């Protein structure tokens, strides 16, 4: 009952999931003058595998790849987080045009796509889904996308995309190391927040990364080839994919930089 079109967007949620106007929903608008450098934070570390990934799928409102998460060598750890979380799965949010498809912004300014690596607590939860219904339950690194070079290691998952672009349809995606798309910098905002797609639960530890990824126009454009659709329905193109800046609602935002 929920998407990103006209009738069923964003703006419409809260009619289904209340929990769509409470006091942590995410994105963010992310004032990094306004962000509180916090020196005592752990440095963050994503310490990740090279073949933990399964297979990559359109599932109607992103494209997601998933990762054996049944040990605790593909994990989140330091920062804001008092314990390693699983890489359970990633997954992007991109726009129509080439100004817009974030989720979070900074200082206003969106970027054309995010990345969103979710992880979960584990060593707590017995499953995912347990976890996503708890505050400290999942632990969401969210990347920008930039266009620029063409990312070499990207290719393999943009050259990937066309065999899923319509619905409900997925492919085995072997050997992709995540660590693969994230920047040279680990500096990074985070904030108590939600899912960002319904149930819109209260659960993630969100950490931004400051730096963004670049991938070609090209790279950008095979994600813009993707369908909303299934293979027998009209075509209608999966762009436009993010939730808009929700309302901070006197929540901190913390810095592990200064700005
Ligand atoms: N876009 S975001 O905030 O990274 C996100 C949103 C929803 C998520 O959960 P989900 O994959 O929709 C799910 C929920 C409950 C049970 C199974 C799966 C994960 C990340
Ligand atoms: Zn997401």
Known sequence: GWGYGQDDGPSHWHKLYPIAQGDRQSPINIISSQAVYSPSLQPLELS?????????????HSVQVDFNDSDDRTVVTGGPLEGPYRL???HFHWGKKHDVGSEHTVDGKSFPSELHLVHWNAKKYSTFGEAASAPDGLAVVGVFLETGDEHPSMNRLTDALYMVRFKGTKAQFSCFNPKSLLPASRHYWTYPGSLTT??????????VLREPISISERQMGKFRSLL?????????????????????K??????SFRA
């Open 48 to 60: 990740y595998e090279a073949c933990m990934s399964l297979s990559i799928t359109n599932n109607g």
């Open 228 to 248: 909303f659709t299934s293979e027998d329905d009209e075509r209608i193109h999966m762009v436009n994919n993010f939730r808009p800046p929700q309302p901070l």
């Open 198 to 207: 319904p149930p819109l639960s209260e659960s993630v530890t969100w950490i």
């Open 88 to 90: 359970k799965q990633f």
């Open 250 to 255: 006197g929540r901190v935002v913390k810095a």
